[PDB]
Design a protein around this ligand. Structure first.
Ligand SMILES: NC(=O)C1=CN([C@@H]2O[C@H](COP(=O)(O)OP(=O)(O)OC[C@H]3O[C@@H](n4cnc5c(N)ncnc54)[C@H](OP(=O)(O)O)[C@@H]3O)[C@@H](O)[C@H]2O)C=CC1
Ligand SMILES: NC(=O)C1=CN([C@@H]2O[C@H](COP(=O)(O)OP(=O)(O)OC[C@H]3O[C@@H](n4cnc5c(N)ncnc54)[C@H](OP(=O)(O)O)[C@@H]3O)[C@@H](O)[C@H]2O)C=CC1
Lengths: 348, 348
């Protein structure tokens, strides 16, 4: 069926349920409470299912190292710093990002349900995987969900060459008559996790392919200059840091550390709008689905086969891999079995 | 001094205060209440001062025609449809966009002040000028302001060629130790109002220069395809319509009519976050200004002179034109005097 990425011989199909239980085995063996392990697995598996290799199991080694080094708190006391009927400022106590984000989004949904609006911001957290995972939580509840997060410095501001801004993604999910609308994008042309594109910044600023890791930097949405809107992708990145890092009293991208480090201080932004408080949900669903249908049905470009709606490719890719299995690269699969050997659990 | 656009002989310096009083004369002569006329003038003049010609006085003829044709309600009964301590759904009753947006943002600021958060959405409104104008209102109050609006169909979705999406801008303003941070951008590479760029969509999809007006279409931030993130600018445009048009029970871009038409149904989104409810405002200002200083001071690209912060060029351009005067194109100035003659008031 349809699948977002290109899978060949260098890939091995792994039963979704198998990959999931594996992750849970490793995490619980390291002391992660079973329920928290299930949240992390759910988040990482969703990424693999939707075709986001960069944020799937390939990143399990990152969390494992963070747990072993004490850079990730196994029993975080996620505390509410400031709060109101429609908002809350949370301190993640260095817990897994998935756990901090899961609890933060659950609280935002609760507040929206009760007041119409829910805005929860968190600081002192860790990498939380795909932003769409949290936005979707609200959509599955019949509400609009928005999630953002800052990250390690990897992008250069317009007119500069240093890695100072994060890939800071933005995600919005809304319910429809069918599957939720789901926008989930890094504010840079591409995520660093992708490079296994367009973010061409070399030594002084060019491109290449491997000069990125060697003191290189990614480009913000819009591109290299100001001509094609590069300064806009740069602004969007700042919006994320202002709403996440600055407003929470946490920190911005430049100072976000790797997961293995204590005090990574990754910050997140969660916002939920209870559609029902505004207009009937069924009316909302009818109208948005009609918009989606009309957009898809609009005059296709000769070169193009189809006009997709955000989240569509991912849901189709998921559907496929659920009965066909999740394709995991060769070297990554080896990596996961080595992790299994190290911690002492059955591998894949 | 510094100025965002290029001004030559084809431009005439007009005292800011002079341009302002002119607009107010024309509008009040057409029956617009004096206070509402001052709001419109303030919004249009700010655009000219910040160097946004496309949304300044050059658009006075648009509002004039709408007023004369009944497409703009002179005495709108701006009504609250749904409301809560932290939100409100407003129906603009076809009033001037500036009036609807001004009252909507004032309400959002009030709710944020009292609860920490304020989200006001409006439907049945009209073109409201620059989005940054409303976001700035909140920043000048010591809060974070976010504003969005949908518009007439001018952009083609990724993989298509029809004008179906709006240029739907996004604006965020935050207070700093100095002048407010101000991001204000269309989600398309450029606004249609600019074409007097990068939005290359011709007859079937290419570029050119004049083929845009002739059945052409603008390109979404990211560009023509999917390779450089074109689908992201496309998603951002939808986010705006979902938060503005769909959620409000109004309508999305494809169905937004020109100002002169009754029922233009332009919709807006306003969001205010009272910083103080989260962290001390003075701490917020210190931290964001430190981030801005560090970004500007980062390693400059050889080709580039300076790294700007969003809103900086505009504020500098304004500063200049306030003591040097606002430069108005030749043909536009003629247009304004003709309007003055038609309505019967002193021109420029
Ligand atoms: N935790 C962190 O610090 C970071 C996490 N990330 C995450 O990594 C992932 C990488 O995202 P990124 O590469 O920027 O995004 P992509 O370019 O893959 O996708 C951008 C969005 O556009 C949609 N889309 C893709 N193609 C089309 C099309 N032809 N027409 C319409 N919509 C389309 C996608 O939906 P679909 O789902 O269908 O593909 C998606 O919502 C994200 O999930 C992001 O949240 C990124 C940076 C940092
Ligand atoms: N009412 C409507 O229906 C619509 C209104 N609009 C409005 O029209 C205007 C057109 O905006 P648009 O052309 O997209 O935006 P620009 O590309 O001019 O500006 C994008 C943003 O980036 C900032 N910026 C510009 N150059 C740099 C740089 N080198 N480094 C860092 N930041 C930079 C700007 O600040 P600065 O202020 O300093 O220039 C601005 O906030 C906006 O004000 C928008 O709100 C657009 C579409 C529709």
């Amino acid at each position: 069926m349809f699948e977002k990425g290109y899978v060949d011989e260098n890939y091995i199909r792994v039963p979704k349920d198998r990959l999931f239980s594996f992750i849970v085995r490793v995490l619980t063996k390291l002391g992660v409470p079973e329920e928290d392990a299930k949240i992390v697995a759910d988040n990482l598996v969703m990424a693999d299912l939707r075709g986001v290799e960069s944020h799937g199991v390939q990143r399990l080694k990152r969390y494992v190292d963070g747990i072993i080094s004490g850079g990730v708190n196994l029993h975080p006391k996620i505390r509410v710093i400031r709060e109101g009927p429609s908002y809350a400022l949370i301190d993640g106590d260095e817990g897994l990002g998935q756990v901090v984000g899961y609890r933060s989004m659950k609280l935002a949904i609760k507040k929206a349900k009760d007041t119409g609006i829910g805005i929860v911001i968190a600081r002192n957290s860790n990498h939380y995987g795909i932003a769409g995972y949290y936005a979707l939580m609200a959509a599955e509840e019949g509400m609009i969900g928005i999630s953002m997060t800052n990250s390690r410095p990897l992008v250069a501001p317009t007119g500069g060459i240093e890695r100072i801004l994060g890939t800071n993604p933005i995600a919005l999910a809304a319910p429809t008559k069918d599957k939720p609308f789901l926008l989930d994008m890094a504010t840079s042309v591409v995520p660093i996790g992708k490079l296994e594109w367009a973010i061409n910044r070399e030594g002084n600023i060019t491109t290449k392919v491997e000069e990125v890791f060697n003191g290189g930097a990614l480009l913000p949405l819009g591109g290299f200059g100001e001509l094609l809107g590069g300064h806009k992708g740069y602004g969007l990145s700042l919006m994320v840091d202002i709403l996440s890092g600055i407003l929470s009293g946490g920190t911005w991208s430049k100072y976000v550390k790797n997961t293995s480090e204590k005090g990574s201080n990754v910050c997140h932004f969660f916002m939920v709008i209870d559609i029902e408080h505004f207009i009937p949900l069924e009316e909302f669903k009818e109208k948005i689905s009609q918009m989606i249908e009309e957009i898809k049905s609009s005059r296709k470009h000769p070169e193009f086969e189809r006009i997709w709606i955000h989240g569509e490719k991912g849901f189709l890719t998921m559907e496929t891999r659920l009965k066909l299995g999740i394709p995991i690269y060769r070297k990554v699969l080896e990596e996961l079995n080595e992790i299994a050997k190290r911690v002492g659990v059955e591998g894949l």
